[PDB]
Amino acid sequence: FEFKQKYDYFRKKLKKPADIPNRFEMKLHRNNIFEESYRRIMSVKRPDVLKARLWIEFESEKGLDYGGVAREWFFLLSKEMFNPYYGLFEYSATDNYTLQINPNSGLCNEDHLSYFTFIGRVAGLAVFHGKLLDGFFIRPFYKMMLGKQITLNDMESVDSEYYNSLKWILENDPTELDLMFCIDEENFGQTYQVDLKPNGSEIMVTNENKREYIDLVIQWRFVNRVQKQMNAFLEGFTELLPIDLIKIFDENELELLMCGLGDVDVNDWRQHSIYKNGYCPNHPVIQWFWKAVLLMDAEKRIRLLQFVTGTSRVPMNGFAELYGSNGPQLFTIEQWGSPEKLPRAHTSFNRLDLPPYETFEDLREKLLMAVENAQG
C-alpha cells in the first residue's frame, strides 16, 4: 500500500507543458544506439519537448509498433550507458554487478561530464514516462540523489567484510594493526600507495583519530572521486524532474522507482546451471526445483538467487557471465545431505547443496523456508 499510495501522488504532481510537440521524433540504428541517442537528446534546447510521447523507429527492425519501441529503447540504451566497459560506470565488485561511478571516468572518455548529464537526461526522462532503466547501483548512488549523507553504515550492502572490519576499527583500539592514513591501488600488476590526507603515508591510526580515519576511507570509497560526475548526472536528471519532488521516496523506493525490481529471467537461469555429485538436467529433484522456481514470484526468486550467490543482481549478459570469489562460476546445484536438512549454499562458488527430496511439496517447503527465513 504505502509505496503504491506514494507513487501515484508522485505521478500526478508531474505536469506536461502545453507548448511541446505531440510526440518526440526518434529514429536510429540499433547498432549505434548510444552515440545517436546521445546526439539527439543532447541537442534539444527546449528540454521540455522531451516530455512529449516517445515516438521511436530503427532503420533495422521495422516493426510497426511505435509505442513499444519505447520500452525497448530504454532497455537497449541502458545496456550501453551502464556497461562496465564503456568507462562511465563500473561494477562495485567482480561478483556484485551493482553499478557505481568510475572515479577514473575522465581518463577514459575525454569530456565525460557531458555524457553524465546525458545519462541523467535519459535516466530521469524514463521516470517521467514510467519506464525503467536496466542495471542497479550501490545504495550510495540513490542516497546522493535524495540528498542523504553517506556513512559507514552504507558500505555493508556494497562490501560486508569490509564494513565489519571498519566497524571493528570503530569499536576497538587500532594501534596494534599498525595502519597508516593511506590505501593501496593496483594497475598493470603494480601496487601503488595513496594518501588519505596530506602525509598520511607517514601517520598512524591511533585511538584518537580512528574516527577521522574511517571518515576518509568512506569519503574516498564513495564520494571524493565522483562529485563532479554525480553532479552532472543530476544537472540532467532534474532537467526533466524537480529533484526535491523525489525526496518523498526512500533509498529502496527510489531504486524500485527507476530500476524496477530485479525479476530474474528463469530460463537463462536454468540453462546456464551446472549440476554436481549425482544431479543432472532431467533428474527428479532437479525437475522439481525449477518447477518450484516457476511458482515463486519476483521477490522469492531474487531472494533464492541472493541466498545461493550472495547477490540479488545478475550480470549484464545474463547467467552465462556469473562470477564467484575466484572468477567465472555458473549457478551450481550439488546433491548433499538427508531430506531432513534444509538446503545450504556457498555464495563463493554460487553453489546450492540440495538434499535429495522425496516429494515436490517436500522440496518446495524446505526451499521456500531456507529462502525466506534467511540471510543470517
Binding site: 565489519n164 571493528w168 597508516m180 590505501i183 593501496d184 591501488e185 600507495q193 555429485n277 575466484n326 548433499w336
Partner: protein, 146 residues
C-alpha cells in the same frame, strides 16, 4: 597494508607457528607461500602440503585469500585447494594474524568439519565409513604430499 605485512612477517620469524612456515617468495610482499605438515597420527601423517597466500590490496580490511596447491583428500578442501574455513570469510577480523590462520588450518586437518562440508562425497565417507576415509586420505598423502 605494507607496514602491516612486514611486521607480521618478522613476528613469524621471532616465534613461528609450529608445523607451518610461510613467507613471501620472489620480491612481492603480497604473494606468500606456506607449508603445513600433516598433523601427526592423522591420515595425513608424513605428508607436507604447500599453500598460496595472496594478500589483497584491501588488507587487512578484507581477509587474505588462502589456498592449498597440493592435492589433499579432506571434506572442507576441494581439488582447487579452496578452504572452507570461517575466519577466512564471514569471520575475518583485521586483528587476526597469519600465524593464527595457519594454525587454524592444521586444526581442520586432524579434525574435519563433516557437517559444513565443501566436498559432499568425502563428508559422507568420514561420517559413515571412517576407516575408508582414512585409507583413501592416507593414500593421497603418498601420491601428492610426498
Amino acid at each position: 597494508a605494507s607496514k602491516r605485512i612486514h611486521k607480521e612477517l618478522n613476528d613469524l620469524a621471532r616465534d613461528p607457528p609450529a608445523q607451518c612456515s610461510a613467507g613471501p617468495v620472489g620480491d612481492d610482499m603480497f604473494h606468500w607461500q606456506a607449508t603445513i605438515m600433516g598433523p601427526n597420527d592423522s591420515p595425513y601423517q608424513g605428508g607436507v602440503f604447500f599453500l598460496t597466500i595472496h594478500f589483497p590490496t584491501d588488507y587487512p580490511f578484507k581477509p587474505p585469500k588462502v589456498a592449498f596447491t597440493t592435492r589433499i583428500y579432506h571434506p572442507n578442501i576441494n581439488s582447487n585447494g579452496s578452504i572452507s574455513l570461517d575466519i577466512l570469510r564471514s569471520q575475518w577480523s583485521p586483528a587476526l594474524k597469519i600465524s593464527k590462520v595457519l594454525l587454524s588450518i592444521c586444526s581442520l586437518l586432524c579434525d574435519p568439519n563433516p557437517d559444513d562440508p565443501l566436498v559432499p562425497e568425502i563428508a559422507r565417507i568420514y561420517k559413515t565409513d571412517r576407516e575408508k576415509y582414512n585409507r583413501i586420505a592416507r593414500e593421497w598423502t603418498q601420491k601428492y604430499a610426498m
